[PDB]
From a paper:
In particular, the superlectin BC2L-C is believed to cross-link human epithelial cells to B. cenocepacia during pulmonary infections. BC2L-C was also found to contain an N-terminal trimeric domain, which features specific millimolar affinity for L-fucose and high micromolar affinity for fucosylated histo-blood oligosaccharides. Thus, BC2L-C presents a double carbohydrate specificity, maintained through a hexameric assembly, which makes it a superlectin, hypothesized to crosslink cells by simultaneously binding bacterial mannosides in its C-terminal domain and human fucosides in the N-terminal domain. The first generation of antagonists was thus designed as a panel of β-C- and β-N-fucoside glycomimetic bifunctional molecules, simultaneously targeting BC2L-C-Nt’s carbohydrate binding site and its neighboring site.
Author numbering:
A (entry chain AAA), B (entry chain AAA), C (entry chain AAA): -1 to 131
Amino acid sequence: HMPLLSASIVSAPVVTSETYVDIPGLYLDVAKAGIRDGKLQVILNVPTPYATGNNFPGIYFAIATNQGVVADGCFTYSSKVPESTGRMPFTLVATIDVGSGVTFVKGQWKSVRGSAMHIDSYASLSAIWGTAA
Amino acid sequence: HMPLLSASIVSAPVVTSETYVDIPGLYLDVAKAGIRDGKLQVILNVPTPYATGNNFPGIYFAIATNQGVVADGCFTYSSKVPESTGRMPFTLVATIDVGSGVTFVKGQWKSVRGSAMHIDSYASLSAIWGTAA
Amino acid sequence: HMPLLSASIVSAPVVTSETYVDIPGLYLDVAKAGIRDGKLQVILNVPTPYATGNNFPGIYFAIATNQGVVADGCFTYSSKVPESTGRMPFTLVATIDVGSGVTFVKGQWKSVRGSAMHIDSYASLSAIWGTAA
Ligand SMILES: C[C@@H]1O[C@H](C#Cc2ccc(C(C)(C)CN)cc2)[C@@H](O)[C@H](O)[C@@H]1O
Ligand SMILES: C[C@@H]1O[C@H](C#Cc2ccc(C(C)(C)CN)cc2)[C@@H](O)[C@H](O)[C@@H]1O
Ligand SMILES: C[C@@H]1O[C@H](C#Cc2ccc(C(C)(C)CN)cc2)[C@@H](O)[C@H](O)[C@@H]1O
């Protein structure tokens, strides 16, 4: 199979969430590609996000499979209410064993301290497929 | 062919530009490597840039081919005139079909709100070649 | 061999250092995997670091082999003493010739202006192995 997988978006809804929720469009269907084992290096690339809020805003991002979150991180501003919420590039890299029950990979996000989360431009979820055989 | 491509620099000129312009040295010649089809996962990695200016400075970065920009994003500061313009790591990831007429990939940049753009250390443009055959 | 290598951590010690020192756990043993030539695309992904200090704090990060640093960069805050030291995602990408004497790859860090360096969540060092043969 093509060993490179990719999904990209030019925007997402403006979301406020206390729990991880799917970023629509950042989804790789691994099972649909016939990939049932080996490893995937997965990159979640959100180069131009921002967060608005009243209390040191930010966004948690995760890579999740059907089995749940495999990796996560966040950016946060260094002011309680920034003068202007600047664009804070974010990248997350994880390697996943597909033989462990993985059928899909997706990007998720969750609010820091009740922030509104913003993706209004290019963002991507990428994967490279490696096998030992 | 080697499926890993890479170009790196330790500096660029200080540029002010209203339009995307080439970051000298961040250029992959795909055609020269004999790669005429398949997909390239391309990473533009500018880990230590800064921007100076008078109006919430920042830099737009793009991945471009001979056919134009395929992906772009930016970082911006959260103050009109930051006390000190800190280093703002930036990464951009895109996957490109080479069979669509691609002969080269390059990194580009453009000013946010008339910023001077600064790369004065390591930066890289990387690609991994994948084929379905 | 599996062409994907990966090491990840959920925390590191709090370190103050004027010199590059190893981030424990971010280490790929290339020689142990039987990889004695070709190229490695290496990604150091520290999505959620922060630095505390008195003088525009930050962290230098490097990719190093047994032969020393191959690439480095940093993030820094734009205030002398930030109100709150926010999370500053950081990614570094380098491609390395393994035939040049490389047996391991590791992530390193060093203080900016006497900062305490913080990793208290997921971080990763990843590599994809490419050969021309
Ligand atoms: C919330 C504010 O958003 C503004 C923007 C933007 C913007 C994002 C993306 C683009 C692409 C070229 C990547 C897509 N067309 C272009 C403009 C910032 O300038 C401010 O600092 C601040 O964060
Ligand atoms: C504009 C100012 O630039 C200063 C720098 C730097 C600097 C960059 C790169 C390096 C490498 C090790 C990566 C290359 N040698 C070392 C020092 C910052 O400390 C300030 O916060 C601020 O942004
Ligand atoms: C120093 C302060 O650290 C705080 C944090 C955090 C935190 C980091 C990681 C997580 C994961 C979900 C990724 C891991 N569980 C969750 C909370 C920030 O909110 C402040 O802005 C500020 O930087």
